[PDB]
Point group: C2
Chain length 400, copies 2
């Protein structure tokens, strides 16, 4: 298909089937970085992401849109033909739904033995009958993985937001698919990848869970955004706003304590010389440290705290609100937020390509396409005549 040559993934052909966040995020990331990516949508039901007024202009940029019944008669034929020149196919569905519909990995590989197939589901491609075919949702994946129970406040768990598990799961699929693609270069044989959202999230939540698994205790939840184990780390309130800080290092602790009224604790058996990180539970003075830290910070502005903390080499930052990002000097200097044109000629604002590749940078070359916009071009590209396409459309098997 016509598109500029750019990025590390120029020339790669990626196809995805899925809706909403997790699967499409995985597929579209290839498009950020130069791949030819085809978004498959159902003929009767467009991707529900399109209900949102602005997000999809970002989350579906740089894509080609195919609308095809990939499971029925000529529609299935056209889909399996497409696979013959596809490098990576990503699909998100409820367990082994593709196999139940007659599109097994084996059938995909009959059409392209080199194909890298990524299956993204809530609970995996196999397991028990009770869980395997259950719906995939971000909240459920967080609930089921131990991630949710570690988020929120001491007496109020909550999910990480927004839809954190969908992003982790999608990104993992992209990563895994690129890894499998590497192996195809050497062997000429494809791969199938079983990405279960709860397993992705299990891994992301191990920092303290590893203690529980190996004889120790699970950590508590944060109290008002303060770290559950490390004093002076996390979220604090100043006079005119919130900050985060990380009270780490020998001099940092000594100088900070001088400021807040706790110079007398330095050199004690509880906070001995050379202490570089305070554990709030193990240290009897943990609660006192927080009382004095809170009191000192509450009488100072963010600007004052940042100025002192810079003098003391204490890591910190203002908690930015969304309205403060666009004018922030680092954002401006790095063009972190940019603008592009939608397919219907309106200006859209949003994040630039990340990360920044030096030799082969990504770029935004196309706005989000409409439902079935590229169907005719795609089918022509894989050998369908104009009459064939008109016939697919008349049968209800494709939408142009």
């Amino acid at each position: 298909l016509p598109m500029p040559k750019f990025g590390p993934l120029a020339g790669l052909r990626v196809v995805f089937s899925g809706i909403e966040i997790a699967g499409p995020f995985a597929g579209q990331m290839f498009a950020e970085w130069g791949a030819e990516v085809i978004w498959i949508e159902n003929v009767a039901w467009a991707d529900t992401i399109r209900v949102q007024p602005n997000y999809p202009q970002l989350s579906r940029r740089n894509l080609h849109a195919l609308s095809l019944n990939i499971f029925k008669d000529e529609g299935r034929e056209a889909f399996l033909k497409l696979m013959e020149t596809t490098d990576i196919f990503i699909e998100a569905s409820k367990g082994p739904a593709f196999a139940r519909r007659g599109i097994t990995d084996e059938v995909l590989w009959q059409h392209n033995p080199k194909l890298v197939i990524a299956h993204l589901s809530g609970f995996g491609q196999y397991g028990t009958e009770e869980y395997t075919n259950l719906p995939a949702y971000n909240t459920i994946a967080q609930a089921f993985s131990g991630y949710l129970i570690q988020n929120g406040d001491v007496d109020q768990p909550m999910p990480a937001f927004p839809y954190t598990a969908d992003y982790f799961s999608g990104l993992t699929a992209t990563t895994a698919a690129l890894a499998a693609l590497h192996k195809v270069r050497e062997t000429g044989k494809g791969e199938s990848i079983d990405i279960a959202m709860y397993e992705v999230m299990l891994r992301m939540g191990q920092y303290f869970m590893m203690d529980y698994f190996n004889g120790g205790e699970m950590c508590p939840r944060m109290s008002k955004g303060k770290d559950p184990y490390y004093a002076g780390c996390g979220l604090y309130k100043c006079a005119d706003g919130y900050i985060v800080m990380e009270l780490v290092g020998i001099t940092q602790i000594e100088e900070c304590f001088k400021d807040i009224g706790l110079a007398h604790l330095l050199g004690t058996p509880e906070i001995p010389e050379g202490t570089q990180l305070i554990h709030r539970i193990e240290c009897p003075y943990g609660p006192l440290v927080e009382e004095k830290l809170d009191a000192w910070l509450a009488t100072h502005t963010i600007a004052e705290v940042k100025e002192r903390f810079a003098e003391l080499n204490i890591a910190c930052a203002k908690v930015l609100t969304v309205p403060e990002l666009e004018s922030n000097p680092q954002y401006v200097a790095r063009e972190s937020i940019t603008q592009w044109q939608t397919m219907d000629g309106r200006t859209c604002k949003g994040p630039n390509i990340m990360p920044k590749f030096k030799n082969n940078p990504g770029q935004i070359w196309r706005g989000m396409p409409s439902h079935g916009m590229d169907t005719a071009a795609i089918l022509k590209n894989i050998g369908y005549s104009e009459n064939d396409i008109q016939e697919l459309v008349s049968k209800g098997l494709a939408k142009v």
Copy 2:
């Protein structure tokens, strides 16, 4: 170096410099999937991850350990020699620290023009003097990207936990490095990748932020784990604990509303016939819906709710505590949590390899190595003699 051949990344040589989570997580993921990965530590002190009693057994498995001063004299010479047979080099530092120390991308590419170099920093490799060279932390990246302000409760922001931004940033580095590796296989030209943690997290927080950038409003924070925008979605309290639910679908909404006492809202302007998903912002009876839903849930046990919701096909799950995972049938069937031996011969429990590659699965072949365990073997493998290695040790430039 001696190791089993397995996984999609068998034969790939990866080296990383960094400590704690973000950089090492990026490097170690290659090792999960079969690569030869070398972990660089300093000489006279080790990676601070090692102070954790259990996590590092997971986060540093399948690794080789090199202890080498890569910036100074003959230590630098040995590092640049190692780069000649390295495919991917990952480093986490404060901005362009490697360049400041004398190791520019140009120097690296003099030794291997194919080298894929991933630079992971808080604020990027370039930008303003004020921000570019500031410390990299998870809390700071959340604060500076607008992620933190979107997490927590209505009147209490908080970070996503545990250390969510380090995991997103590290995972992105792995992904981007694999993409650049594809380009190397195609053109022979290496790459330098500027991964700024705040830009990673900017992207993960766009679902509602795109509305703010394009004329609309920002979304509020969750209330006690409930979605800020969609009614009947998120965390709820039953008689005997927490669940998550997703009130999505026509009959789901109708039958739930009848159960909870709101049948009179159906077929109205506020909840039109055929409503699939209630947008709370715009529905005048959103608070009433939450009131009635909470009252009904509070009189039923988690089991009673799951039973009814299974009848209605409403997606839901119990919020699992960490003690509930190991015996869960899906975890058992999929061997999601497994055991392996540490290098000193103890049994360690934790997550299996994820995701599950069908043809070339990952495996756990080695426990976390000790500080400088593989220094001698690595230096020997790239042409150093026993005497040359002893001289590095006496000079304080390597540890064995």
